Structure 1
Amino acid sequence: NLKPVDAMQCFDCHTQIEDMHTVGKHATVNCVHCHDATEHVETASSRRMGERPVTRMDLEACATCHTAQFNSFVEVRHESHPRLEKATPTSRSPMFDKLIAGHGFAFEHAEPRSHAFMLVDHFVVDRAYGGRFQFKNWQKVTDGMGAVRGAWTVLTDADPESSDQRRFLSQTATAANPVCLNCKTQDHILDWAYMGDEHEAAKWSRTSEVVEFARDLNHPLNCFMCHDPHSAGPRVVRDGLINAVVDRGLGTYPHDPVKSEQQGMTKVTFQRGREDFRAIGLLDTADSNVMCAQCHVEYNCNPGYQLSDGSRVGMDDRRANHFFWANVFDYKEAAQEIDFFDFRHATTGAALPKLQHPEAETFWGSVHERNGVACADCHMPKVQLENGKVYTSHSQRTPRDMMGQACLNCHAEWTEDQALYAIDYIKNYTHGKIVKSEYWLAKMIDLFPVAKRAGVSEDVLNEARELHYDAHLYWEWWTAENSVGFHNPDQARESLMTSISKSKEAVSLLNDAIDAQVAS
């Protein structure tokens, strides 16, 4: 059984913790619930850590007093089909292989599934670690509780004796790097300096051997990613988000200065040896839009190249951990502002961006966002009980599973079937335009080899490559974004029509240039 420790002794050296813990709703929660600091207290000074205390990062540290929230979190939605590749005719991007050729995502890009699996899924996807990690067997894919207990309870490593990123199977890639893990776990929260910069107190950084880092990480989506463990108040911990919102002054709602002020973020920095080390962002309100934006954003978390001169941008560069914090129509400017692109298309040679799940940036300016609705209202609502103490569901999932609570309480004019019909109208329309955009991108891409072989000039090919960047951006945003337009239907429509327009311009340019070469 746990035995409490004297917090006042800790507070002597930990003023920031005292100021947070004594005021919030964890003022009665003893440190022993999460820390084993006996040897630390014996050896520390006011400025030197001495022996390092043990800090629990397992979600069960919270389950003890918050079982309802933990159990709701760890539930597996079996209807969220697992390991479902998006580059298939029946999923989100039928022509993805042709369009993304040159990028690691060609090796595998599955639809998301329940949060419990995020860290294990990161480890086992074919694009990440060369197939090094696997579930212990194919049965273990069901085990959400086991994944939560720890990745290494359910996974195996093909070669514990080496730590290099390499292929273990032919059709894999080694795209993973340390930055990725910030959106899968925060087990490393005390071992990683802000932004993953090099730091004498950091075990891990952007430039670490990712296989070694991986082995040190266990738990998905720690509860403390959204809730300060000391004050119990709302927060974010993701460095890239704090950097966008606070350091770069863009605000929590870049398009709305007032809402940004009302629903803001305060950066709190913790030091090691009186040098800034790590930071958190305390939220003015329990604003799920910003909490979920720790991960459900478009980002850089990878090496790339400069738009200006084509030179390599490696993991050592700050740009390798970056939140663009820009909607689809501001993205090109945001990529220009850091002089960055992700890859060269394998067929066209165009410099292209790689877009990833920009739900937060897409939601900005939508009718729901403008009306004060937030992700949690649709994806983790309060639970309705005939007789019971209400709590917030932590099963982050489609509203289709809880339409009473997610939609119909605010849309009293609709039945469940009507609300579902409205969702489907948007998704069906948007998906149709995604497919049309892919058709036209594919048509353009297929002309590049024909044009090169016909002797079309590099000047013309480069004009087409410039169009490819835009045709790509204004399409891929929407295969990346998980709502199939629901989050911002008018924006999706405008963007996808722009993609098609750009591809059609490139097709005409290339066809005319090929025909002129042939005629000559």
Structure 2
Amino acid sequence: NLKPVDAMQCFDCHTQIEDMHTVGKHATVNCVHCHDATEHVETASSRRMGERPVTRMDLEACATCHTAQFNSFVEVRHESHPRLEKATPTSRSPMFDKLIAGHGFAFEHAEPRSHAFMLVDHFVVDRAYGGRFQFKNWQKVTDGMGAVRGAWTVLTDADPESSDQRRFLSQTATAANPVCLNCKTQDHILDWAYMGDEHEAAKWSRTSEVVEFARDLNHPLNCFMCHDPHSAGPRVVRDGLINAVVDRGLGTYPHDPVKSEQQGMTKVTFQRGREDFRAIGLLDTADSNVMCAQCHVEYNCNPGYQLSDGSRVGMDDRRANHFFWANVFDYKEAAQEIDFFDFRHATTGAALPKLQHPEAETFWGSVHERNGVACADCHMPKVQLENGKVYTSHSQRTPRDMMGQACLNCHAEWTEDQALYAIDYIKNYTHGKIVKSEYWLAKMIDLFPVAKRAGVSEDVLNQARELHYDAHLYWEWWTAENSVGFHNPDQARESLMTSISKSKEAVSLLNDAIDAQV
């Protein structure tokens, strides 16, 4: 059985913790629930850690007092199809292989599934670790609670004796790097300096051997990513988000300075040896838009190249961990701002961006966002009980499973079927424009080999490559973004029509140039 410790003894040194813990709703929660610090207390000084205390990062540390929220979080949505490749005719991007050629996502890019699986899915996807990590067997794919208990309870490593990234299976890639893990787990929260910069107190950084880092990590989406364990108050912990909002002064709502002030973020820094080490962002309100934006954003978490001279930008560079914090129509400028692109297209040679799941930046300026609606209202609503204590559902999933709470309490004029119909109108329309955008991208791409072999000039090919950047950006935003336009239907429409326009321009350019060589 747990035996409480004297928190006043800790507070003698830990004044920041005192200030947070004594005031919030965890003022009665003893440190022993999450820390084993006996040897630490025997050896520490006011400025030197001494023996390092044990800190629990497992989600079951919160589940004995918050079982309802834990059990809701760990539920597996079986209707969220697992390991479903997006580059197929029945998924999100039928022509993805042709369009993404040259990028690691060509090796595998599946649709997302329930949050319990995020860390194991990261470890086992074919693009990440060369096939090094696999489920122990094909039964384990069902085991959401097991994944939550720990990744290494359900996975194997093909070679525990080596730590290099290499291919164990032929059609895999080794794109994983330490930055990725920040959106899968925060088990490393005490072992990683802010931004992954080199730091004498950090075991891990942007330049670490990612296979070694992986082996030290266990739990997905820790409860403390959104809730400070000491104050119980709302927060974020993701460095790239704090960097955008606070360090670069862009605010929580870059398009709305008033909402940014009302729903702001305060950066709190913790030190090692009286040097800044790590940071958190305390929120003014329990604002899920910003909580979810720790991960559901467009980012850099990877090496790339400079737009200016084509030189390599490695993991050592700050730009390898970057939140652009820009909507689709501001993105090209944001990428120019840091002089960065992701890959050269394998067929066209164009410098291209790689977009990823920009839900937060897409939601900005939408009708729902402008009306004060937030991610949680549609994706983790309050539970409705005939008789009971209300709590917030932590099963983050499509509103289709809980339409009464997610939509119909606000939209009293609609039945469930009417609300579903409105979602599908947008998704069907948007998907049609995604498909047409891909058709035109593909038509352009297929002209590049013909143009090159016919002797079309480098100047014309470069003009077409410049068009390819924009045609790509204004399409791929929407295959990356998970709502198929629902989050901002007018923006999707405008973007996708722009993509098509750019590809059509490039097709005309290249056809005319080819025809002139004949």
Q: TM-score range by the shorter chain?
A: over 0.9
**How far is the alpha carbon of 1:151 from its aligned partner?**
0.1
Identity %: 100
> How much does 1:183 deviate?
0.1
Q: CA deviation at 1:43?
A: 0.1
Q: Which runs of 4+ in 1 moved over 2 A?
A: none
Q: CA deviation at 1:217?
A: 0.2
Classify the secondary structure of the residue corresponding to 2:117.
Answer: helix
State the 1:265 CA deviation: 0.0
TM-superposed CA distance for 1:67, in Å, is 0.1
Q: Name the structure 2 match of 1:476.
A: 476
Structure 1 residue 118: deviation in Å?
0.1
Displacement of 1:383 in angstroms is: 0.1
How far apart are residue 31 of structure 1 and its match? 0.1
| Residue 85 of structure 1, CA deviation | 0.1
CA deviations over 1:292-343 (Å, ceiling 9, x no partner): 0000000000000000000000000000000000000000000000000000
Structure 2 equivalent of residue 174 of structure 1: 174
Task: Tell me the distance in 2 between the aligned counterparts of 1:476 and 1:50.
Answer: 50
Secondary structure at the counterpart of residue 138 of structure 1: coil
Indicate whether 1:351 and 2:326 are aligned: no
Q: Deviations over 1:123-162 (max 9, x none)?
A: 0000000000000000000000000000000000000000
Rounded to whole Å, the distance in 1 between the matches of 2:445 and 2:385 is: 55
Q: Aligned pair count? A: 518
Give the Cα separation in 1 of the matches to 2:511 and 2:64.
66
Q: Does the residue aligned with 2:466 lie in a helix, a strand or coil?
A: helix
SS in structure 1 at match of 2:139: helix
Shift of 1:273: 0.2
Q: Secondary structure at the match of 2:502?
A: helix
Deviation digits for residues 451-472 of structure 1 (CA, Å, limit 9, x no counterpart): 0000000000000000000000
> How far, CA to CA, are the matches of 2:56 and 2:233 in structure 1?
19
* CA deviation after TM superposition for structure 1 residue 384, in Å: 0.2
Q: Could you say which residue in structure 2 is the equivalent of 1:50? A: 50
Aligned mates of 1:209, 1:502 — CA distance in 2? 41
Structure 1 residues 35-184: aligned runs within 5 Å: 35-184=35-184
CA distance in 2, matches of 1:26, 1:458: 65
Displacement of 1:91 in angstroms is 0.1
CA displacement 1:358-397 (0-9 Å, x = unmatched): 0000000000000000000000000000000000000000
Which residue matches 1:458? 458
Partner deviation per Cα, 1:469-497 (whole Å, 9 max, x = no partner): 00000000000000000000000000000
Deviation (angstroms), 1:46: 0.2
Distance apart, 1:229 and its partner CA: 0.1
CA offset digits 1:99-137 (Å, max 9, x no partner): 000000000000000000000000000000000000000
How far residue 436 of structure 1 moved from its aligned partner, in angstroms, is: 0.1
Residue 257 (structure 1) shift = 0.1
Give the Cα separation in 2 of the matches to 1:81 and 1:271: 43
Deviation of 1:350 (Å): 0.2
- Unaligned runs of 5+ residues in structure 1 are none
Write the distance in 1 (CA, Å) between the matches of 2:162 and 2:364. Answer: 45
Provide the rounded CA distance (Å) in 1 between the counterparts of 2:236 and 2:399: 24
Distance in structure 1 (CA, Å) of the matches to 2:327 and 2:156 = 39
Counterpart Cα distance in 2 of 1:38 and 1:517: 80
Offset of residue 435 of structure 1? 0.1
Deviation at 1:233, TM superposition (A): 0.1
CA distance in 1, matches of 2:98, 2:50: 55
Secondary structure class of the residue paired with 2:437: helix
Tell me the secondary structure at the aligned position of residue 281 of structure 2: strand
Deviation track 1:5-27 (CA, whole Å, cap 9, x = no partner) reads: 00000000000000000000000
Distance 2:282 2:245 in 1: 12
Partner SS, residue 90 of structure 2? coil
Deviations 1:421-447 (A, max 9, x none): 000000000000000000000000000
Partner of 2:434: 434
Q: 1:35 Cα deviation (Å)?
A: 0.1
**2:420 aligned counterpart, secondary structure:** helix
Aligned counterparts, 1:209-224, within 5 A? 209-224=209-224
Deviation at residue 410 of structure 1 after TM alignment: 0.3
Post-superposition shift, 1:209?
0.2
The match for 2:309 is: 309
- Aligned partners of 2:56 and 2:215: how far apart in 1? 17
Distance 2:503 2:169 in 1: 36
SS of the residue corresponding to residue 414 of structure 2 reads coil
- Offset, 1:37: 0.1
Please give the residue correspondences for 1:212-251 in structure 2 after superposition, counting only pairs within 5 Å.
212-251=212-251
C-alpha deviation, 1:411, in angstroms? 0.2
Deviation of residue 54 (structure 1)? 0.2
> What's the CA shift for 1:168?
0.3
Structure 1 counterpart SS, 2:78: coil
The separation in 2 between residues aligned to 1:169 and 1:204, in whole angstroms, is 27
Alpha-carbon distance in 2 for matches of 1:320, 1:17: 32
Q: CA deviation at 1:30?
A: 0.1
Q: Which residue of 1 aligns with 2:318?
A: 318
Secondary structure at the counterpart of residue 280 of structure 2: strand
**Secondary structure in 1 matching 2:269:** strand
For residue 511 of structure 1, report the CA deviation from its aligned partner: 0.2
Cα distance, 1:97 vs. partner? 0.1
Distance (whole Å) between structure 1 residues aligned to residue 481 and residue 128 of structure 2: 20
Partner SS for 2:509? helix
| Stretches of structure 2 lacking an aligned partner (at least 5 in a row) | none
Shift of residue 228, structure 1, vs aligned partner: 0.1
1:255 deviates by 0.1
TM-superposition CA deviations, 1:235-274 (whole Å, max 9, x none): 0000000000000000000000000000000000000000
Q: Equivalents in 2 of 1:306, 1:243: separation in Å?
A: 21
How big is the shift at 1:33?
Answer: 0.1
For 2:452 and 2:411, the matched residues in 1 are separated by: 56
For residues 462 and 13 of structure 1, what CA distance do their matches in structure 2 show? 61
CA distance in 1, matches of 2:386, 2:234: 28
- Distance, in Å, in 2 between the alignment partners of 1:236 and 1:109 is 27
What is the CA–CA distance in structure 1 between the aligned matches of 2:368 and 2:246, rounded to whole Å?
A: 25
Structure 1 distance, partners of 2:315, 2:28, is 42
Distance, in Å, in 1 between the alignment partners of 2:480 and 2:312 is 25
Q: Distance in 2 between matches of 1:71 and 1:226?
A: 17
Within 5 A, what are the aligned runs for 1:324-335? 324-335=324-335
Residues of 1 paired with 2:12 and 2:165: CA distance? 45
Q: 1:276, CA displacement in angstroms?
A: 0.1
Measure how far apart 1:399 and its partner are.
0.1
1:266 and 1:235 map into 2 onto residues whose CA distance is 9
Distance in 2 of aligned mates of 1:296 and 1:331: 16
**C-alpha separation between the residues in 2 aligned to 1:23 and 1:516?**
76
> Could you list the per-position Cα deviations for residues 148-186 of structure 1 after superposition, in whole angstroms to 9, with x for gaps in the alignment?
000000000000000000000000000000000000000
